[PDB]
Amino acid sequence: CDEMVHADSKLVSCRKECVTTGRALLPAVNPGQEACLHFTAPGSPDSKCLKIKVKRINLKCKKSSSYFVPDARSRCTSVRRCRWAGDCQSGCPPHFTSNSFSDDWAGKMDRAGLGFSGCSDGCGGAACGCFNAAPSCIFWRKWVENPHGIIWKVSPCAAWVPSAVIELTMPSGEVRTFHPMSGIPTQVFKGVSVTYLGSDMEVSGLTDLCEIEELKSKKLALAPCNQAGMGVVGKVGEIQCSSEESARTIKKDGCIWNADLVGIELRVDDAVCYSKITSVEAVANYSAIPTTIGGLRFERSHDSQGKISGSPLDITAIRGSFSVNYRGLRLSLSEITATCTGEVTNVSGCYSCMTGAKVSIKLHSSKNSTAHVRCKGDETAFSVLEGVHSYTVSLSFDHAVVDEQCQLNCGGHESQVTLKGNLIFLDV
Amino acid sequence: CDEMVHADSKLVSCRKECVTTGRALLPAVNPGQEACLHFTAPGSPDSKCLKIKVKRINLKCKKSSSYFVPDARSRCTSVRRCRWAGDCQSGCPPHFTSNSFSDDWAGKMDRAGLGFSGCSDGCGGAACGCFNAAPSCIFWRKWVENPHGIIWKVSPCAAWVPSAVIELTMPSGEVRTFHPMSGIPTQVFKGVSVTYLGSDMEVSGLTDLCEIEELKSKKLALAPCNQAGMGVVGKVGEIQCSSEESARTIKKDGCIWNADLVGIELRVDDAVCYSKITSVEAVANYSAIPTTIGGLRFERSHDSQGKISGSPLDITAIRGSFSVNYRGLRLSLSEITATCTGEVTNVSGCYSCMTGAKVSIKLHSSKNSTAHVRCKGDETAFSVLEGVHSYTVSLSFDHAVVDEQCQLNCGGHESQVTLKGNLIFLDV
Amino acid sequence: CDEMVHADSKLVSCRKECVTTGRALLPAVNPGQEACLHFTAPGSPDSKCLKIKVKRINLKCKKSSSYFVPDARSRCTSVRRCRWAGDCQSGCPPHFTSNSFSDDWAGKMDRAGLGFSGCSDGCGGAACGCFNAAPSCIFWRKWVENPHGIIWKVSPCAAWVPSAVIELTMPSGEVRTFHPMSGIPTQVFKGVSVTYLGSDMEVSGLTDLCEIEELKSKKLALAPCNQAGMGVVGKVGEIQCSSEESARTIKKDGCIWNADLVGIELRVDDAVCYSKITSVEAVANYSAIPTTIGGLRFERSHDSQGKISGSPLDITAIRGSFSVNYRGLRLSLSEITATCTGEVTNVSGCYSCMTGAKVSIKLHSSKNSTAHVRCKGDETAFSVLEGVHSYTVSLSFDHAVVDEQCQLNCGGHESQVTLKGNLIFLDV
Ligand SMILES: *[C@@H]1O[C@H](CO)[C@@H](O)[C@H](O)[C@H]1NC(C)=O
Ligand SMILES: *[C@@H]1O[C@H](CO)[C@@H](O)[C@H](O)[C@H]1NC(C)=O
Ligand SMILES: *[C@@H]1O[C@H](CO)[C@@H](O)[C@H](O)[C@H]1NC(C)=O
Ligand SMILES: [Cl-]
Prior knowledge:
The structure is a homotrimer.
Chain A: E1 7-14, E2 18-29, E3 34-40, E4 47-63, E5 67-70, E6 73-81, E7 84-85, E8 88-89, E9 115-121, E10 137-145, E11 151-169, E12 175-178, E13 185-189, E14 192-201, E15 209-214, E16 220-223, E17 240-241, H1 244-249, E18 255-256, E19 262-264, E20 273-275, H2 280-286, E21 291-293, E22 296-300, E23 308-312, E24 318-326, E25 330-334, E26 340-348, E27 357-365, E28 369-374, E29 379-384, E30 387-395, E31 401-410, E32 413-422
Antiparallel strand pairs in A: 1-2, 2-24, 3-4, 3-25, 4-11, 4-23, 5-11, 6-10, 7-8, 9-10, 11-12, 11-15, 13-14, 14-24, 15-16, 17-18, 19-20, 21-22, 22-23, 26-27, 27-30, 28-29, 28-31, 31-32
The site of chloride ion has 2 residues of chain A, from loops.
PDB class: viral protein
Keywords: viral protein, phlebovirus, viral membrane fusion, glycoprotein, class II viral fusion, bunyavirus, huaiyangshan virus, emerging virus, zoonosis
Assembly: trimeric
């Protein structure tokens, strides 16, 4: 097993009772690493074997206020009336503001729909067909509608919190996998308890991301977005609604937007509509779960405290700590370093991209361990299994043609592998 | 007294002036947790008691450049002059640019204020009241003003750093509360010194936030904003000024903006003003201190290193570490586990929101300790005091009606509590 | 030789054979701090000296998808044709959309460039030079182009990862300097190995930054930007291209933009172009490296991964951890505390700014150590050398005139220093 215990002590704890007790500290346990502790009673040379393993440490999205986003399509129309016809009596009437409708539009329109209307001056003379010679009125409105009724629920991730899953193997052979309470001792067997002291992750300053979920396809995505109530043009949430029903038809009462998302000019007798709306569907496709951002792999979650869980691809970039309290027993450790040799089969993917290149490598390891791969461009560490298995790791490059040598290491035994491949650049 | 010492050692330290010394390691102490260390001399058979407690670990806003924002109101005006009247003598004069003013606007306008002017062509013939038939001139200006003179100071938080407040109890009973220097030993009494080794915090990737302060009400807020010199439309700082005085009237001499924050459409005989300005008063009211963002509660600070200090609601998400060096003394520990039972009195607030629901719980604790509450949807941990006291904890829910059971745990003694209440969804 | 070892233990390590081994834990080592370990054999007076030092811990930009940004300038043109001249036969022809070009534009236009065209009505009657009285047609196009051919490559930093550099001094005096792999033991000499357990940095929630590099000057900057494919107006990346070739002339096949970055006002016979494009050169100039953001100094990197390395100015805000495994040897430590006295020579710079004021201080230290400076306005810590040297440190103030007392400390020896200076406020 692995070298995980880095401190062992005999302590005198009191309440006035006082008992001599043993206490071991495991300060840095990466996921996949395993400690094997043996406890021997005074009378019997037999040892009880306890195994302590960090199965996984998940990053959980700590959400802010959620909102809904419709699949918006731009729309507009316009009608012109002479200076003595219709509502246009001596210019634009004062009541025709941004939420006004004209009876001369004749097109099917949602009176409760989200949009922006207005009155403006048009051509006047008889050369454009008006008895009056002064300029006329052009009643126009630009608005958005949601055909197909596609809706996403957007939840910005205000922060990310580690959630550990530990695996403890009893001397009886029973395996207990659970999310531990930090600082709370877990009684494993007679005289011995295990306490999870907390988690550490070396990745910091993660860019702002949001959980995006389509309400009737249930597909998940993770991408930047606006906070609830914000409408910065160019991001998901520029059009947002406070409920699913409001987003179904984009109603005024529940949705907000920036009216400049639809461009409208005013010609003599028509209007051209220029959609400036950012496609939420295109963002959901590009950022679809599973995805890799900032060296963190984000996938669908196996628990209920968040549908998305994250973890670094470099397995040594996140760690747990343990305290083992044992009384009436003597501690011994099972420790051996690992060895591994490797060959890389293919190197494909993209360079200077968010995902990073994909390096395929087959590797034989003497035991379950952690393999390290270090190039001049990037480094990573991943868990490997005993025997011969193939692995696909993510390494970043900044050039198209890759032909360099990198180092491979398990437990201090260093080897070399050959990366030969070609990478592409993604469009924006 | 809690279980905080996880390693104790006897060392041989030299300077060669070699001395045998003891050193205890406290690697993970949450705020509210407390260690009790007893030291006995080889001669005297009784102990001196030293108590080490992490009172608080505060997150301090590491500010970038600050700026000032006014309570801005959109505004514009326009006048139309025939081609042989007024300054319009030969169409729009080239000198009349974005900072030019017309003496015909007839408004008590601030000629030093931030805004944008311009001249455009209008209706020409006698059909719109001009003897000349060539097209007239429209002198217009869109600008922004600050009635009531309300100003906010905005300081973007480029990063957050932990600031620990530790509390040492001497055998004399004297309590010393101070912010320790990491790595600097603090002499407590004869032969013993304690050293703070640093702080750890698990919440990562916190969204960009800014300290916002009203200048003559002093009320604080924490919300997203532009950096200094940036003017993204839709966030605080779209209009920003380099001094309090320039923001009082929004002077062009010290303020910057995007002129598209105000839309102006030119029609004959008047112009309509489209306000696209984000209400800073609306943002500061919603994000008012105290506020809870991403599992962190931000409140007014008790020190002088910034007016806002943050801390995780789950107190086990932040921790400090100590080293205790003792010479000529034998270390013994006071350690006892806590038990608690509780009942939940009220469950109110919102769901799927930034702050989270509020769970009120009466709890009896056998000692100062940490209580854990784990539900199927969320989990938290909070400090409790000895005896019967009431607490208000924040738990997140994604549905309106809450009627479920959750687990309560102090020191590995688990009981159950029932949550009943109704929650509302926040509007954007 | 500082006090870095906080735990030493004797362990029984097995693989049926077992062996007794010593293991020392160094849980918190700041940059510049050094541990001195001495190993003696039971029957031998020969002592072997081992020095463990953290040279520095660097933050590395974990890059997202890269893109290219040109130095764009606004441009537009316009022509007007009477109702029966040119393409204007029956009003504006429908086949003239945003990507159309009129053959009557005088200046030569890049028909493959990025821009936006359109047809609009204008003055009609003989008062503006047309026989027909119906409104004429105005053919216009607003676009951007890249004179001088200046291009930047932008790489958003999705996250930051620490990268430690340690140096080990052998008993032979040899110094071995390398970036360690976390968890991999480094054999130093017979019976002793050193393992790096990981890095902790207390700075969290760092604002989103991007690496900006001019392709032909190689100058670097670090500033906020748009993600790849995003075009929020007001940030770097509002105009972005997927290749250096597309950015050389701002072609449409590879670049994207928001057409509202160029404003066009169509008047009777001319067109005026309004540029609201954010100057990238101004951002790269202001944010040029080396720069200080959020208490972290970002400088040109000395390694191969990334051109930029970050590190806290407060050296106690980042730390490494070591484990020393030694067999058949007894451990003894060399530990001396430091003393230092100092006086500040000059206090200049800005207040309420991202960089903070710069404080120059001459300081006499008895050894290599860490000096702490505590004011009521700010606190920092920096590495000092043995002897008398001058240091420049960054401390933050919120007022213009500084007249306050501050405290200096090395190894628990506290004195006082008197900062006096004047600071200025930066414009937006
Ligand atoms: C190695 O890992 C595999 C899969 O997790 C497991 O089945 C096997 O028992 C492990 N080997 C050990 C624990 O020796
Ligand atoms: C429990 O905490 C309170 C306030 O934090 C303190 O006054 C009291 O002395 C503590 N009880 C102990 C240390 O036994
Ligand atoms: C002090 O630091 C300097 C520079 O880091 C180094 O050259 C010198 O050897 C150090 N002194 C020691 C290790 O005693
Ligand atoms: Cl972080």
